[PDB]
């Protein structure tokens, strides 16, 4: 029954800082980090970083490496980021997510993914006056047939491993992982996502495409430079509906 609940929006002039957390409550699991992922309005994921609070060793994404710091108070199951320094381009939607370790017959094992998200945290920066993984824009079909999502990446991303993930999101709510390790769907997710990669392109296929199914997509993955990226994102209209 694990969530995470973070703080409320903040609005911010060029060159201060924020700071927001990230609450975790409802379960008992410990074997996890927490990951921090922002999206500009009308634009895609970027990964920014992550801590495993068992350590407290955090680790960022070059971009925002000297001006983000992610920490965590276990006391409190609590975790932050502060970007500091803030600009036009960080006006975005942040989100924390749980980056788990979970457990089967080989033990403790990273599924490379986000599994659960918080409900984002907008950031405005008042006006002042001024991708490894690439995905098609958008793809527009009818209901009832099977359409397949690309995602091309490079050789130390999509190419590299397995760690390569699918994540839907609609209006107003945090992405959902529908698949993990190439082709895994998590419990409850549907079976008419399926996974698969050849090279450097990950693909998803919806079967059977439901109204429902109308979304943006956007595929991620784990790098060779320990971190993560994700797509530029498609977004998927089912026609008639
Ligand atoms: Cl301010
Ligand atoms: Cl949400
Ligand atoms: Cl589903």
């Known amino acids: 029954q694990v969530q995470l609940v973070q703080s409320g929006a903040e609005v911010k002039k060029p060159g201060s800082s924020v700071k927001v957390s990230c609450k975790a409550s409802?379960?008992?699991?410990?074997?996890?980090?927490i990951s921090w992922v922002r999206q500009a309005p009308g634009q895609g994921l970027e990964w920014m970083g992550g801590i495993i609070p068992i350590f407290g060793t955090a680790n960022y994404a070059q971009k925002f490496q000297g001006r983000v710091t992610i920490t965590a108070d276990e006391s409190t199951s609590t975790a932050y980021m502060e970007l500091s320094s803030l600009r036009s381009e960080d006006t975005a939607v942040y989100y924390c997510?749980?980056?788990?370790?979970?457990?089967?017959?080989?033990?403790?094992?990273?599924?490379?993914?986000?599994?659960?998200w918080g409900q984002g945290t907008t950031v405005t920066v008042s006006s002042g006056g001024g991708s490894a993984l690439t995905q098609p824009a958008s793809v527009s079909a009818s209901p009832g047939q099977s359409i397949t999502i690309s995602c091309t990446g490079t050789?130390?991303?999509?190419?590299?491993?397995?760690?390569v993930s699918w994540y839907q999101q609609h209006p107003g709510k945090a992405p959902k992982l529908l698949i993990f390790d190439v082709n895994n769907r998590p419990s409850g997710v549907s079976h008419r996502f399926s996974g698969s990669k050849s090279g450097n392109t990950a693909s998803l296929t919806i079967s059977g495409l439901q109204a429902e199914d109308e979304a943006d997509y956007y595929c991620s993955s784990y790098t060779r430079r320990d971190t993560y990226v994700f797509g530029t994102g498609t977004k998927v209209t089912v026609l008639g509906e």
């Open positions: 997510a749980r980056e788990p370790d979970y457990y089967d017959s080989s033990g403790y094992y990273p599924i490379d993914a986000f599994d659960i």
């Open positions: 409802g379960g008992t699991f410990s074997s996890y980090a």
């Open positions: 050789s130390s991303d999509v190419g590299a491993y397995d760690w």
